[PDB]
Amino acid sequence: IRKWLKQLFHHLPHETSRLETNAPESICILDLEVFLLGVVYTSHLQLKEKCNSHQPLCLPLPVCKQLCTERQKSWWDAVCTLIHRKAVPGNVAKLRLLVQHEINTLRAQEKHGLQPALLVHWAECLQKTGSGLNSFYDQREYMGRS
Amino acid sequence: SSLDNIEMAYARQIYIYNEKIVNGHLQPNLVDLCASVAELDDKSISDMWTMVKQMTDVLLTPATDALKNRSSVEVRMEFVRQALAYLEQSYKNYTLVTVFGNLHQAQLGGVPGTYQLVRSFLNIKLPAPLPGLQDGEVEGHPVWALIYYCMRCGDLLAASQVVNRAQHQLGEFKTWFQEYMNSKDRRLSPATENKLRLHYRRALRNNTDPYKRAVYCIIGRCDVTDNQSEVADKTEDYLWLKLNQVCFDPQDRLTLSQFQKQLLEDYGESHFTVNQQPFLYFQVLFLTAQFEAAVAFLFRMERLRCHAVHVALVLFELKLLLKSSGQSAQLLSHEPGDPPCLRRLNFVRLLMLYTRKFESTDPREALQYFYFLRDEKDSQGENMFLRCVSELVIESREFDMILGKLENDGSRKPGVIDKFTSDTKPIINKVASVAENKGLFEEAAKLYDLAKNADKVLELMNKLLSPVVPQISAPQSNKERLKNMALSIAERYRAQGISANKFVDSTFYLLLDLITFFDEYHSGHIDRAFDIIERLKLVPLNQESVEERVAAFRNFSDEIRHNLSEVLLATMNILFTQFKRDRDSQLRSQARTLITFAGMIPYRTSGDTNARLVQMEVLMN
Amino acid sequence: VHYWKKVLPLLKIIKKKNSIPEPIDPLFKHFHSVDIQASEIVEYEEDAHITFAILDAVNGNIEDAVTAFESIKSVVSYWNLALIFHRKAEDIENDALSPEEQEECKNYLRKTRDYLIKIIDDSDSNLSVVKKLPVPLESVKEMLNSVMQE
C-alpha cells in the first residue's frame, strides 16, 4: 500500500512535521495508508454481514457496487483533487475543510470514530509494515504511529 | 475578587473553551468566544476583535509550524488583502455614519448603493466645488472624487460604473481601469502597468486634481513616497493607501517587509500615541501582520491587559503566534537566527504576568489560563502547566479546592485540576514535598495521604508521634489531634489493605500501641496497661527473653528507642504500684528483668532512668 | 559543553572588565599570565557555540545544530555540516522510496561535496586553517573521494 500511495501522491511526506494541528496541508502518506486500511477493514466487514443474510472475494471489479461509504469516497476524492492540484479556487475552502474533518480520526484524536479492533489492526499492521523496512527514517515513523 | 467586570466575562468564556477541549468536543472559534464579551463594552473593543477575526481568517495549513506559515509569501499576501478589506469596509461604515446620524438610522431606510452613498457622501465633505478639479463632473460631482471614495469603500464595480458614464472625458483610463478590476491581487500587467505609470510620471506628477493623483498611483502602485496627504488625511486612509502600493519581487517600489519595518522603526509608538489613543497604533501593527509587536504594545496599557492577552491566545491557538524559545528573554525580541523584520513574543512570561494579578484569590480562573502552557516545558523538564499548579498551590494553600479533599472516611472528592489531567500523583507529591521540606509534617502527611503514598505518610506520622508518646492525652491537646488522625489513618490503611515497607509500617503500628499504653497508664488502669506492654514483647519480663529482646532493640526505629526511657519507668511504676496492693516473687523477678535489660541497653537518659529503676526495685523487697 | 556552561558566566563578567572572585587554596594554581582578556572573549563564545551545536547534532537536534553551524563560517562547522549532511543522504540514497524524496536525498550529498571542497580550498591556501581542521586534512580528502564516487 505504501508503494501504491507513492505512485499516486509523489513527494507527499511519510509523516508531517506539523502533526500538532489537523489542517489538511499536513496530510501524510501515513494518514492515507491508515485510511485505506480502515476502508478495507470496514468494507470487508460490511460485505461479510451482507452475505451472511443471503463469494465476496469472487466478484470482479466492474460488477461489484460501491464498497466504501460515500463519506469515505468523498474524502478520498477531495484529498486527491487537492493534492494533484485539480481543485477549484472557489471550492478550495470546502474541499480543504472536508479533508480536515476526518484527519482527527485517522490520527486517533478527539472523538475518533474508531472501534478498538480497527485501532489494534492499524497498530500491528504498521509495526509489521515498519519492522520490515530497511531505513531508519521509515522504521521510526511507522513504529511511532504504531 | 481581583477580576474586573470585563476580565471576569473573559474568564467564563475561557472556561468554556477549556471545558470543550477537556471533554474532547469540537474546537470552537476562540476569536468568536472573545468577541462575545466585547459587545458588552464600548465599540472601541468590538471593532478590535472584528479586525482580529478578519486578519486571522486566512486559509492555513493545519498541523504546520507557526514560523513557517508566517514566513510563506502565500500567507503574507492574504494578510494584505484581509486588511485592505477591513480598511475598506471600516471606511464604508464611516461614510454611513457621516451621511446618517446612526447606523440604525441608515439601516431602517435601507443602506443605499455604494454609488449613491458615496454621492451622498461627497455632498457633505465637499459642499462647494474645488477649482482644481479636472475631467468634469458626473451627475453633479467630480468624476475622480467618485472613483476614489468608491475604491476606498472597496466597491470597484461602483467605481467602474462611474467610468462608464464618462468614457469620452477619461480618455484611455477606461481600458486600464477595466484591467485592474479584472486582474486579481489588485495589480495590472507589467506592460500596461508601465504604460500608465510613464504617462502619469510624464506630465501628471503634479496635477491640480488630488483625487486624480490618488487613483492613478493606487492603480499603478507608484509614487510610494508621496502619501497623497490631500485625500488620505486619516491614519486608516494612509494604511489603506500603502497596502494598495506594496509590491512583491528596484526604484519607486515598497514591500511589506520595508513598510512594516519602516513604520515602527522610524515612526514608533511615540509618533502614533501622541494623541493618547492606544488602539490607533495597535491597528497599525495588527493590519501590517506585526502581531507580536501589537500584542506586547497593547499588553503594557494597564487598562487593556485583558484584551492583549486574549488576542495573543487567538494567535496562539491558530499557530500564528511566534513564541520565544528561551524563557529568559524579554517580552518582545528578535531571535538572533531569524530575519530582522519579524519579532517574537515570550508567551510564557506574558501569561505569567497576567496570572499573578488574580491567581491569589481566584485560583479556578488562573488554572484556565495556565492550561495553554500545557504544551511547553522548562529547562528542568517539568510540564509548565503542572509546575504552575504547584506554585499556585504552594502560595494559595487552597488544597481542598484545587487538589480535592480526602476526607477521613476514605473518599477523594476530585479537585479543579482533576478536570485537566487524570495523573495527579506527581504534583500532589510536589506540593507535599515542599511542605515536607518546610517542617509542615502534619500537612505533608495529609497531602501525601491524599496521593495514597503510605511510604511518606507513615514516615512523617512516625516523627509526629514519637515526641507525644509519653505525653498526657488531654482534650484538644496536640496528642489527641495527632493520635486521632493516626487512628483515622490506621483504619483506612487496614480496611483498604495499604502498608509501607515493614520498617516504616512496623514502627507506625508499634507507636500506636504505645500511645495506648500511656493513655491507659495515665488513667490509672494499671492492669489494662500492663497487659498491652506484655503483648508488644518490647521490654523483657522473664530473664530468658533478655538476650533476644536486647538484640531486637539494636534494629528498632530510633523513634522507638527514644521513648524507651519513659516505657521502662512506666512499666516499673506499674509493677511498683501493683506491689503495694507467690505474686510478690513474680513482681520481684520481673522488676529485676527490667533492670538488667536497661543495664545492657545504651539509650536516652540511661543515667537517671537506670537509677530510678533500681530504687523502685529496692522498695519492693 | 559542561565546562563551557560553567565558564560563560565568568566570561560575561570578564567581558565587562570586572573582577573574578579569586579562589581559596585552589587545586590548580591561578596565573595572571593566562588570565582571559576581552580580546579573546567573543572567540570563546563562538568556539563554545560550536561545541553546543556539535552536542545538539549528536543528540538529535539537527535543525538547531545546522541553524547554529551555518551562522558561523568556520572551517570546523563545515566538517560538521558536511558530516551530518552526508549521513542524511547515505541512508536514504538507495532504498526504494518516493522519487521526489530521492531527489531531495541526492541534494544533500551535493551539499556534502561542496562543504568538503570549501575545506580543501581554504585549507591549501592558508596554514592557520590547516591547524583548525577538526580532523586531519588527508581524512577530509579521503571522505571526498568516496563522497563523489557515490
Q: Does the distance separating the beta carbons of C92 and A6 come in below 8 Å?
A: no
Per the listing, cell 454609488 goes with: B115
User: By C-alpha distance, which of B125, B168, B131 is closest to B146?
Assistant: B125
Tell me the three cell numbers of residue B375: 504544551
Which positions in chain B touch A100 (Cβ < 8 Å)?
62
B255 has which bridge partners?
A: B247
Q: What angle do CA B305, B269, B280 make, to 5 degrees?
A: 70
* CB crowding B68-85: b at 16 or more within 10 Å, else e: ebbeeeebbebbbebbbe
List the single residue in A6, A12, A134 with the smallest CB-CB distance to C95: A134
CB atoms within 10 A of CB B453: 19
Rounded Cα–Cα distance for residues C81 and C54 (Å): 10
Q: Is residue B543 within 8 Å of residue B599, measured between CB atoms? A: no
- DSSP calls for B354-408: HHHHHTTT-HHHHHHHHGGGTT-B-TT--BHHHHHHHHHHHHH--HIIIII-B-T
Q: Does the distance separating the beta carbons of A135 and C92 come in below 8 Å?
A: yes
Rounded Cα–Cα distance for residues B516 and B521 (Å): 8
Which positions in chain C touch A3 (Cβ < 8 Å)?
96
Tell me the three cell numbers of residue C94: 538507495
Per the listing, cell 509618533 goes with: B271
E-strand ranges in B277-342 read 332-333
List the single residue in A18, A96, A100 with the smallest CB-CB distance to B65: A18
Q: Is residue B318 within 8 Å of residue B312, measured between CB atoms? A: no
List the single residue in B25, B59, B63 with the smallest CB-CB distance to A16: B63
Rounded Cα–Cα distance for residues B55 and B314 (Å): 11
Q: Is B109 on the interface with C (CB under 8 A)?
A: no
Closest chain C residue by Cα to residue B336: C71
Beta strands B137-138 and B141-142, pairing class:
antiparallel
Helical H runs in C36-98? 38-59, 62-71, 75-92
Which positions in chain C touch B337 (Cβ < 8 Å)?
67-68, 71
Residues 6+ apart with CB under 8 A from A4: A36
Q: Does the distance separating the beta carbons of C92 and A137 come in below 8 Å?
A: yes
| Mutate which: C61, C67, C72, vs B, most B CBs within 10 A | C67
Q: Is residue C116 within 8 Å of residue C75, measured between CB atoms? A: no
* Residue B253 to residues B191, B204, B249, B258, Cα–Cα distance (Å): 17, 19, 10, 10
Rounded Cα–Cα distance for residues B415 and B435 (Å): 19
Give the SS3 label for residue B344. Answer: strand
Per the listing, cell 509501607 goes with: B500
* Chain B neighbors (3+ CB pairs < 8 Å): A, C
Rounded Cα–Cα distance for residues A5 and A14 (Å): 10
Q: Is residue B515 within 8 Å of residue B469, measured between CB atoms? A: yes
Closest chain A residue by Cα to residue C91: A135
Q: Does the distance separating the beta carbons of A11 and C98 come in below 8 Å?
A: yes
Rounded Cα–Cα distance for residues A13 and A20 (Å): 16
Rounded Cα–Cα distance for residues A15 and A10 (Å): 13
Q: Is residue B62 within 8 Å of residue A26, measured between CB atoms? A: yes
Q: Is residue B514 within 8 Å of residue B568, measured between CB atoms? A: no
Kindly report the backbone phi and psi dihedral angles of residue B328, in degrees, each rounded to the nearest multiple of 5, phi listed first: -90, 0
Give the SS3 label for residue B333. Answer: strand
Resolution in angstroms for this experimental structure?
A: 37.0
List the single residue in A19, A22, A93 with the smallest CB-CB distance to B59: A93
CB atoms within 10 A of CB B210: 19
Taking one residue from B and the other from C, the number of pairs with CB-CB distance under 8 angstroms is 4
CB atoms within 10 A of CB B530: 20
Rounded Cα–Cα distance for residues A34 and B404 (Å): 41
Residues 78-97 of C with CB under 8 A from A: 91-92, 95-97
Closest chain C residue by Cα to residue A8: C98
Rounded Cα–Cα distance for residues B318 and B28 (Å): 12
Helical H runs in A58-115? 70-83, 92-106
Residues 6+ apart with CB under 8 A from C94: none
DSSP character for B323? B
Rounded Cα–Cα distance for residues B291 and B297 (Å): 10
Chain discontinuities in chain A, listed by preceding residue (C to N exceeding 2.5 Å) = 54
User: By C-alpha distance, which of B237, B190, B191 is closest to B218?
Assistant: B237
* Closest CA–CA distance from residue A65 to any residue of chain B (Å): 34
Closest chain A residue by Cα to residue B60: A23
User: By C-alpha distance, which of B440, B435, B444, B522 is closest to B477?
Assistant: B522
Rounded Cα–Cα distance for residues B309 and B355 (Å): 10
Rounded Cα–Cα distance for residues B393 and B399 (Å): 7
- Helix, strand, coil % over all residues of chain C, rounded to 5: 75, 0, 25
The H-or-E segment that residue B254 falls in is strand B254-255
Rounded Cα–Cα distance for residues A67 and A73 (Å): 9
Q: Is residue B453 within 8 Å of residue B447, measured between CB atoms? A: no
List the single residue in A26, A92, A110 with the smallest CB-CB distance to B61: A26
Rounded Cα–Cα distance for residues B49 and B43 (Å): 10
Residues 6+ apart with CB under 8 A from A141: A14, A15, A30, A130
User: By C-alpha distance, which of B416, B451, B407, B454 is closest to B432?
Assistant: B451
B377 has which bridge partners?
A: B383
Q: Is A24 on the interface with B (CB under 8 A)?
A: yes
Which positions in chain C touch B336 (Cβ < 8 Å)?
71
Residues 63-102 of A with CB under 8 A from B: 92-93, 96, 100
Closest chain C residue by Cα to residue B325: C64
Q: Is residue B498 within 8 Å of residue B489, measured between CB atoms? A: no
Rounded Cα–Cα distance for residues B82 and B69 (Å): 16
CB atoms within 10 A of CB B202: 8
- DSSP calls for B102-157: SHHHHHHH-PPPHHHHHHHHHHHH--SPPTT--S-EETTEEHHHHHHHHHHHT-HH
Look up residue B521 and give its amino acid.
Y
Rounded Cα–Cα distance for residues B430 and B390 (Å): 7
* Closest CA–CA distance from residue A55 to any residue of chain B (Å): 42
| Mutate which: A3, A5, A7, A11, vs C, most C CBs within 10 A | A11
User: By C-alpha distance, which of B473, B476, B429 is closest to B449?
Assistant: B429
Rounded Cα–Cα distance for residues A131 and C94 (Å): 18
Tell me the three cell numbers of residue B252: 519607486
Phi-psi region of B453 (alpha: psi -120 to 50; beta: other; left: phi over 0): beta
Q: Is B325 on the interface with C (CB under 8 A)?
A: no
Give the SS3 label for residue B158. Answer: helix
Q: Does the distance separating the beta carbons of B24 and A111 come in below 8 Å?
A: yes
Q: Is residue B347 within 8 Å of residue B388, measured between CB atoms? A: no
Q: What angle do CA B332, C50, C9 make, to 5 degrees?
A: 60
Per the listing, cell 510478690 goes with: B584
The H-or-E segment that residue B255 falls in is strand B254-255
Q: Is residue B49 within 8 Å of residue B35, measured between CB atoms? A: yes
Residues 48-67 of A with CB under 8 A from C: none
Beta strands B344-345 and B137-138, pairing class:
unpaired
Q: Does the distance separating the beta carbons of A111 and B64 come in below 8 Å?
A: no
Tell me the three cell numbers of residue B321: 503566534
Q: Does the distance separating the beta carbons of C95 and A10 come in below 8 Å?
A: no
Q: Is A23 on the interface with B (CB under 8 A)?
A: yes
Q: Is residue C100 within 8 Å of residue A10, measured between CB atoms? A: yes
Rounded Cα–Cα distance for residues B453 and B267 (Å): 61
Q: Is A6 on the interface with C (CB under 8 A)?
A: yes
Give the SS3 label for residue C133. Answer: coil
Q: Is residue B285 within 8 Å of residue B311, measured between CB atoms? A: no
User: By C-alpha distance, which of A142, A119, A117, A106 is closest to A32?
Assistant: A106
Residues 6+ apart with CB under 8 A from A129: A2, A33, A142
User: By C-alpha distance, which of B492, B504, B510 is closest to B560?
Assistant: B510
Q: Does the distance separating the beta carbons of B59 and A92 come in below 8 Å?
A: yes
* Chain C neighbors (3+ CB pairs < 8 Å): A, B
Q: Is residue B33 within 8 Å of residue B17, measured between CB atoms? A: yes
* Closest CA–CA distance from residue A136 to any residue of chain C (Å): 8
Look up residue C110 and give its amino acid.
R
Residues 7-66 of C with CB under 8 A from B: none
Q: At what angle do helices C137-149 and C75-92 cross, to 10 degrees?
A: 30
* CB crowding B267-280: b at 16 or more within 10 Å, else e: eeeeebeeeeebbe
Rounded Cα–Cα distance for residues C80 and B187 (Å): 46
DSSP character for B267? S
Closest chain A residue by Cα to residue B68: A18
Tell me the three cell numbers of residue B196: 500608465
Kindly report the backbone phi and psi dihedral angles of residue B556, in degrees, each rounded to the nearest multiple of 5, phi listed first: -90, 145
* Residue B565 to residues A109, B29, B525, Cα–Cα distance (Å): 65, 71, 20
* Residue C21 to residues B157, B545, C24, C30, C45, Cα–Cα distance (Å): 76, 64, 10, 12, 21
Interface of B with A (CB under 8 A): 21, 24-25, 27, 59-65, 68, 319, 375
Give the SS3 label for residue B337. Answer: coil
Q: Does the distance separating the beta carbons of A16 and B62 come in below 8 Å?
A: no
Per the listing, cell 491581487 goes with: B185
CB atoms within 10 A of CB A125: 17
List the single residue in B21, B25, B62 with the smallest CB-CB distance to A25: B62
* Closest CA–CA distance from residue B62 to any residue of chain A (Å): 2
* Closest CA–CA distance from residue A6 to any residue of chain C (Å): 6
Instruction: Say how many CA atoms lie within 13 Å of B299 toward its Cβ.
Output: 23
Tell me the three cell numbers of residue B231: 485625500
Tell me the three cell numbers of residue C91: 541512508
Give the SS3 label for residue B480. Answer: helix
* Residue B608 to residues B415, B564, B568, B569, B620, Cα–Cα distance (Å): 53, 13, 12, 10, 19
- DSSP calls for C15-37: HTT------SS-SS---GGG---
Beta strands B332-333 and B344-345, pairing class:
antiparallel
Q: Is residue A78 within 8 Å of residue A70, measured between CB atoms? A: no
* Residue C29 to residues C24, C33, C35, C98, Cα–Cα distance (Å): 10, 11, 12, 61
* Closest CA–CA distance from residue B521 to any residue of chain C (Å): 59
* Closest CA–CA distance from residue B25 to any residue of chain A (Å): 7
Per the listing, cell 489537523 goes with: A22
- Helix, strand, coil % over all residues of chain A, rounded to 5: 60, 0, 40
Distance of CA B149 to the CA centre of its chain: 45
Per the listing, cell 490520527 goes with: A107
Phi-psi region of B186 (alpha: psi -120 to 50; beta: other; left: phi over 0): left
Kindly report the backbone phi and psi dihedral angles of residue B142, in degrees, each rounded to the nearest multiple of 5, phi listed first: -60, 135
User: By C-alpha distance, which of B124, B147, B118, B117 is closest to B210?
Assistant: B147
Taking one residue from A and the other from C, the number of pairs with CB-CB distance under 8 angstroms is 21
Q: Is B337 on the interface with C (CB under 8 A)?
A: yes
Residues 6+ apart with CB under 8 A from B165: B138, B139
Rounded Cα–Cα distance for residues B577 and B569 (Å): 12
Tell me the three cell numbers of residue B133: 478639479
Q: Using CA of residue C90, residue C91, residue C92, residue C94, what is the dihedral sign?
A: positive
Q: What angle do CA B43, B265, B300 make, to 5 degrees?
A: 45
Which positions in chain A touch C92 (Cβ < 8 Å)?
135, 137
Q: Does the distance separating the beta carbons of C98 and A6 come in below 8 Å?
A: yes
Q: Is residue B254 within 8 Å of residue B226, measured between CB atoms? A: no
